[PDB]
Design a protein around this ligand. Structure first.
Ligand code: AGS
Ligand code: AGS
Ligand code: MG
Ligand code: MG
Lengths: 253, 319, 486, 254, 255
DNA sequence: AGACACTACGAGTACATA
DNA sequence: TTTTTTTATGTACTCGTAGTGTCT
């Protein structure tokens, strides 16, 4: 029934690499309008929400909302068979017991087949709230991963401040202090690297370092990331490549 | 000052099995083994400073001749001797090819074998069993009980004993003759008395007395080296009247800077190793000494606690 | 290779099964077990046979070191045509690579048995493997060591599995209790080792008389390897051995092995040791070393079986009850010392004192003859049962906290004698129509079916519900179970 | 004595790197014809043979066929120090106790002489017999390596099915299964698949042994695979003057 | 008030990485002529001496001599917080405490302000060693590091022997032995690959493998390293930078 | 530019303690 | 005749994700 012919195995590889060490066993809910994946860690601070539409596939077809449970480690184990010149084709039937993955190469003499056994997991309800966020910023994903991994060295608590149209990332450790200051920049020659900032009221929150370290793992999906800060609601971290996107909802202390 | 001289324990360290004044039986055994060859796996146990490491070193040297450098593998407690070392390095040395005379074998000397972990000791069994025709193992330890029984089953057991007065006196006389030192009979007697069968400690005290005063006399030896700690404690516990024991504890132990923990530990050890009195009174004295030690360890260690311990011991001895 | 380069134990090693000394029954049993191995695999080990060997696909040899377990195993392996393979703790043995290798080798054939000789009519078994594991008790405790991995290996394999260890009944070796056929090699008889020593002495021109091997093997405690090493070590200097120098040889080659916590209890409670004569032979230092051989089970065993002996060191004017009371007082003092040791500040330097107060003094107080049997300490099982009951009571208390508003002990002592009358008693005096009342009472305090089952196990004395629940009609119990399951 | 001079030390480096993760102690017998080395696995499942002819050395010297017991770990440690553009020379004197390795640079006079202590390998020399194989095929070594690397991630058992001129690599593990189908296509004319299939053969091998064999996928471009229903399969990497063969035994075909 | 501004911010990173493993704590002396640093290993087997003149600092202002005692496992973390095309600024108040690092990007507008708490190191480090050596050689840093890393796998002791136009590095262990022998040549086509050697008397002394492996970690600074050896004297392993040098005084092992 | 052998530092798991 | 007994730092092992120099 479910037959989805991927554009390239590397795309699904990256979309799975985005959240390797975040969750283990999850339930992909697949419908006709797209595929949604909701995951909640044990510490109850991040909410992994992955949405991939039909326009992200070279061919996607389905006629029944179904559920596919699986582990992420075995998923990456099957994806490790992928190459750079083969496409992935996902096959699922009316009785969900095993997903069939066909690795097809342009040369029709070498075709690969693999199988993934499903596990049953208690799925969680979708969190798609649009509660108003105080400030909204957009920063290149590589630079954000760099600054996060740099500030994680000093202290395990990263302070984000949005004041006087100046973004401040502070990390006061025991050996010293850390303070990276950035200003809103708009670039006209390279429209992928820019510091976009829209502020309505000053923001000042604290976040866990390992949480941001787990979030920045999705930097391989997109060239830039959108971070929405709010003083009364979980902050949003949004990656988007061309049409499929991933979101982390971090509940601040 | 620019440089120092080698101590007499290291300078006059025996290099031939005849120079060892230790246990005659095991010494002649190892001498005949080095003469004939076919050295078996051995474990030498005993007390510190009686000629265990020197004995195996002399045996290996005499047995290997010039091939000592490439045929002897020395591993002390200062080097890593875990499961990984036994797995890799000891096995590579035992499997190493080496052309030796038809009466010699590669020797693996393991100093302080009582400190090796259980995993390494267990792995050494088949390591010494599969290469027992080109590699031999010599362990040198102080407690043979720390080595597992499977390892002891594949080797000979040589238990070294304390050195009698005559042997240490003869060795000290040889050292004095070789060093031209002025000495006297009472000085050597005091040295041997303070040595307690410890040849290394005896030579060290002799060298220290020589370099500090020049003449080896009982007065100098006693002023530079105090009397043995357990003997004064034994004389204190074996006192017949309470005032004598109290005066001994005050003058000999407390007025000289001996900590209460050391005093109570020495009293416990002496009462444990005592043989003058019966078993029940010894157990009661050990009980009282432990009751006192329980207060000494809690930070209540003073002279009053030791005085009360002596008073309770005398009350027990007071029928 | 020459002759004088190997030890006497290697040049006199058994080359066939007819030269093994003692334990003939064990070697014959293992030979029959390995012979019928293919007869056992062809019917999937369902038929055990008259020998009882054939249902287990693995064999575990256990006994003291130096009696010929590995030797006999290798001999039968070479004699029955099985392609031998050995791996032990001297090689790397972990959960990662050892498991992979052994799994790949359980149902793979041998290339050595194929290329060496496979055309003559020797046997169809040369293609098979025999995985002989030595020093099984030398692996790591946890699962990462591979003891449980090997225990599971002894369940699914197509090649015979041989396990050889020196110490069998250990916690690490618990998984091997019901998975492999156990064979125990014991102390060899004096006649076979006597003949072997006669031969190896007449071969090496070693003068030796038949009167000494008895004391030799007695002090050696059943170890032919150590005996051979002893003769090889002393024969180089003393050409002739007899009843004159045997005392020094026995005193210098005494096997100093730690005793199990059962022989320690026998030596501690031995009245002859504490006599005026035995005191100066087995000194107090040796008595403390006895406890230090195993300082974890000796005090428990002493406290368990100190009042189960007949004392022979009773002072004039002292009864058995007085000595037992003094021993129990010293046991309590040693318990206080042990609590001070195994608590904060780590006062381990008080371990020798705990030697005297806990074990030496109470045993000396009641030393004598053993009336019955040396019973194992039940304090371990009682502590485990008490911990389980405390966990269950904690669950019950945290379930009922919303209504009780009391402590754990305050709920066990006073609330349960009423919960019993509320829950279970309406079942005996009303039948099967009182189920709704019990359900309401249990939901009033958020109780569960498992909680109801655990509640009835706390009462003792004249209130033992273990038979009362059986006296309840099964219809009422089934109705209650079905009602709570809806 | 013996003095064997190589062309590039990288050749011997790759030779040792090929079969150094399966066996540890190897006996190298050097005779007037060349070097022959047979090594049994520690699990006695995979036998490794290696032949280097006299026409693979820049200069060969031998007065008597001599055996050298070598540990592959220390040999790899010694050979790792050399570069790609040096001349390697193995030297052995009378009464062999160690082997000397000369690394001589071609653009300079910097000489690096290393010593390697030999081992005592008390192993018997066995005989290898060639027999008829029901199927004999050839395919690029890198492709087989990637198939093994993809299938070993599910289980440790690899089922090989040669049937109707089709190659079927099956991996049945705990999390699903994996199948690879291969059809012989003879076209570059060098990356073709030459296959001769007489009997349809069904064997099962260990994925770990397959990985240890494909780790030597640097001595040639293709692999010579010879199958047999009752004999161990032969995996060969051909050389300019010798070969590296693995005789891997199949599992129990119950 | 110490105020230094580097031309490239990665030079300080490469300099500190040289001491990161072989030295724990440092005490930078900042004067009007440049920054000096002397440190001793925990085992006290090697001595690190770094000197960087005011030529390296794009801007420099030192009102009075300043002493900055700090830890390297934190300074390296602070330096890794920078960027490849950024500039570094060291600031210290009149009283030395809580040194401030400022990373400023030259392509975009970015300010990274980091702090580091100073530590009171009582041991002074002002010793200078200026004595003639028995042999002075100079060889490419990569060629020396290769030999060191290749001979460190054989044993834990590496013996250096200097003879008449011959440099020998010997290593004898348990798995075998090895010796690399080189001759001093003059390369006209490339000067950075030549090997120079001026000897007065033959030298023969051994070092440990760990310290020799830690020393060659500074090979990423300069393309050529100098080695000064003498009869029982701290061997001088020097990497010369375009504004100063880094010199390791290594102590041999007694035989 | 990239893939993967080599590797060293970090969480886990036990094991003694005179 | 048969299996657990707290906390406390030192010791030893292993798997282990990770950071970086090297090879098709
Ligand atoms: N029998 C002896 N004859 C002569 N000198 C001896 C004798 N025993 C010991 N010594 C001296 O003591 C020094 C050290 O002896 P060792 O053999 O190291 O002591 P030990 O018996 O091994 O006890 P350890 O090492 O503390 S376990 C030697 O270098 C000699 O100077
Ligand atoms: N029953 C026996 N008869 C004759 N010689 C024996 C006997 N048992 C042991 N030996 C000798 O002891 C040597 C070692 O035997 P092993 O079987 O290895 O000892 P073990 O019983 O397996 O105990 P280990 O190895 O410590 S587990 C043999 O080579 C023989 O020389
Ligand atoms: Mg010693
Ligand atoms: Mg055995």
């Amino acid at each position: 029934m479910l037959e989805a012919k991927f554009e390239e195995a590397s795309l699904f590889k990256r979309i799975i690499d985005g959240f390797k060490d975040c969750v283990q066993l999850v339930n992909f809910q697949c419908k006709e309008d797209g595929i949604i994946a909701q995951a909640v860690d044990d510490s109850r601070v991040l909410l992994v929400s992955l949405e991939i539409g039909v326009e992200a596939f070279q061919e996607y077809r389905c006629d029944h909302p179904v559920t596919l449970g699986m582990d992420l480690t075995s998923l990456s184990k099957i994806l490790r068979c992928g190459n750079n010149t083969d496409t992935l084709t996902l096959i699922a039937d009316n009785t969900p017991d095993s997903i069939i993955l066909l690795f097809e190469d342009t040369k029709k003499d070498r075709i690969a087949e693999y199988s993934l056994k499903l596990m049953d997991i208690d799925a969680d309800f979708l969190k798609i709230e649009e509660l108003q966020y105080d400030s909204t910023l957009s920063l290149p994903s590589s630079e954000f991963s760099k600054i996060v991994r740099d500030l994680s060295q000093l202290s395990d608590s990263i302070n984000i401040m949005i004041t006087k149209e100046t973004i401040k990332f502070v990390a006061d450790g025991d050996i010293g202090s850390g303070s990276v200051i950035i200003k809103p920049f708009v670039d006209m020659e390279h429209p992928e690297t820019s510091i976009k900032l829209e502020m309505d009221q000053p923001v000042d929150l604290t976040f866990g370092a390992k949480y941001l370290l787990d979030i920045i793992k999705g930097s391989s999906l997109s060239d830039r990331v959108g971070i929405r800060l709010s003083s009364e609601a979980p902050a949003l971290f949004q990656f988007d490549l061309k049409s499929g996107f991933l979101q982390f909802f971090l509940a601040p202390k | 000052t620019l440089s120092l001289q080698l101590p007499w324990v290291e300078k006059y360290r025996p290099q031939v099995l005849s120079d060892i004044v230790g246990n005659k039986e095991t010494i002649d055994r190892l001498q005949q083994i080095a003469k004939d060859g076919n050295m078996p796996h051995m474990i030498i146990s005993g007390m510190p400073g009686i000629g265990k490491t020197t004995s195996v070193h002399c045996l290996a040297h005499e047995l290997l001749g010039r091939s000592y450098a490439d045929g002897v593998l020395e591993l002390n407690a200062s080097d890593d001797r875990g499961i990984d070392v036994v797995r890799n390095q000891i096995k590579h040395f035992a499997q190493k090819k080496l052309h030796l005379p038809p009466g010699k074998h590669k020797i693996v000397i393991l100093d302080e074998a009582d400190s090796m972990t259980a995993g390494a000791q267990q792995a050494l069994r088949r390591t010494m069993e599969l290469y027992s025709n080109s590699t031999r193992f010599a362990f040198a330890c102080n407690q043979s009980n720390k080595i597992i029984e499977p390892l002891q089953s594949r080797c000979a057991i040589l238990r070294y004993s304390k050195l009698s007065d005559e042997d240490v006196l003869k060795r000290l006389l040889q050292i004095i003759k070789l060093e031209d030192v002025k000495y006297t009979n009472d000085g050597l007697e005091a040295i041997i008395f303070t040595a307690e069968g410890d040849m290394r400690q005896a030579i060290n005290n002799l060298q220290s007395t020589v370099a500090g005063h020049g003449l080896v006399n009982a007065d100098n030896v006693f002023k530079i080296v105090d009397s043995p700690h357990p003997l004064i404690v034994k004389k204190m516990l074996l006192a017949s009247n309470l005032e004598d024991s109290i005066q001994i504890l005050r003058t000999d132990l407390w007025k000289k800077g001996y900590s209460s923990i050391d005093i109570v530990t020495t009293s416990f050890r002496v009462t444990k190793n005592l043989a003058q009195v019966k078993e029940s009174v010894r157990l009661e004295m050990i009980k009282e000494i432990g009751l006192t030690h329980m207060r000494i360890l809690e930070g209540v260690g003073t002279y009053l606690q030791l005085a009360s311990m002596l008073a309770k011991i005398h009350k027990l001895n007071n029928k | 290779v020459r002759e004088e380069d190997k030890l006497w134990t290697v040049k006199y090693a058994p080359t066939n099964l007819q030269q093994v000394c003692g334990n003939k029954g064990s070697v014959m049993k293992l030979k029959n077990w390995l012979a019928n191995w293919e007869n056992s695999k062809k019917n999937s080990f369902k038929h055990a046979g008259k020998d009882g060997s054939g249902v287990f696909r693995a064999a575990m040899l256990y006994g003291p070191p130096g009696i010929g377990k590995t030797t006999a195993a290798h001999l039968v392996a070479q004699e029955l045509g099985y392609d031998i393979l050995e791996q032990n703790a001297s090689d790397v043995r972990s959960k990662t690579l050892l498991n992979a290798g052994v799994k790949n080798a359980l149902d793979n054939m041998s290339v050595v048995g194929y290329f060496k000789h496979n055309e003559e009519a020797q046997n169809l078994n040369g293609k098979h493997f025999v995985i002989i594991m030595d020093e099984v008790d030398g692996m790591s405790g946890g699962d990462r060591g591979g003891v449980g991995q090997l225990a599971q290996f002894c369940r699914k394999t197509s090649t015979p599995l041989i396990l050889i260890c020196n110490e069998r009944n250990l916690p690490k070796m618990r998984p091997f209790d019901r998975v492999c056929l156990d064979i125990q090699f014991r102390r060899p008889d004096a006649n076979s080792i006597k003949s072997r020593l006669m031969t190896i002495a007449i071969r090496e021109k070693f003068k030796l008389d038949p009167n000494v091997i008895d004391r030799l093997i007695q002090t050696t405690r059943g170890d032919i390897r150590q005996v051979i090493n002893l003769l090889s070590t002393i024969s180089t200097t003393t050409k002739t051995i007899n009843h004159e120098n045997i005392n020094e040889i026995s005193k210098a080659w005494e096997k100093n092995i730690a005793l199990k916590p059962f022989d320690i209890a026998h030596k501690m409670l031995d009245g002859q040791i504490y006599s005026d004569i035995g005191s100066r032979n087995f000194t107090l230092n040796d008595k403390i070393a006895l406890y230090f051989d195993d300082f974890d089970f000796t005090p428990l065993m002493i406290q368990e079986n100190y009042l189960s002996t007949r004392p022979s060191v009773l002072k004039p004017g002292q009864s058995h009850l007085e000595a037992v009371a003094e021993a129990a007082n010293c046991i309590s003092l040693g318990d206080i010392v042990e609590k001070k040791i195994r608590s904060s500040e780590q006062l381990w330097s008080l371990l020798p004192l705990h030697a005297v107060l806990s074990s030496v003094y109470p045993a000396s107080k009641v030393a004598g003859h053993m009336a019955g049997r040396i019973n194992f300490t039940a304090w371990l099982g009682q502590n485990s049962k008490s911990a389980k009951y405390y966990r269950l009571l904690q669950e019950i208390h945290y379930h009922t906290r919303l209504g009780t508003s009391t402590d754990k002990i305050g709920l066990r002592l006073d609330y349960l004698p009423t919960f019993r009358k509320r829950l279970l008693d309406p079942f005996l005096k009303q039948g099967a129509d009182a189920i709704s009342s019990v359900i309401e009472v249990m939901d009033d305090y958020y109780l569960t079916k498992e909680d109801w089952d655990s509640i009835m196990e706390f009462f003792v004395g004249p209130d033992v519900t273990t038979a009362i629940i059986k006296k309840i009609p099964a219809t009422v119990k089934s109705g209650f179970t079905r009602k709570y399951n809806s």
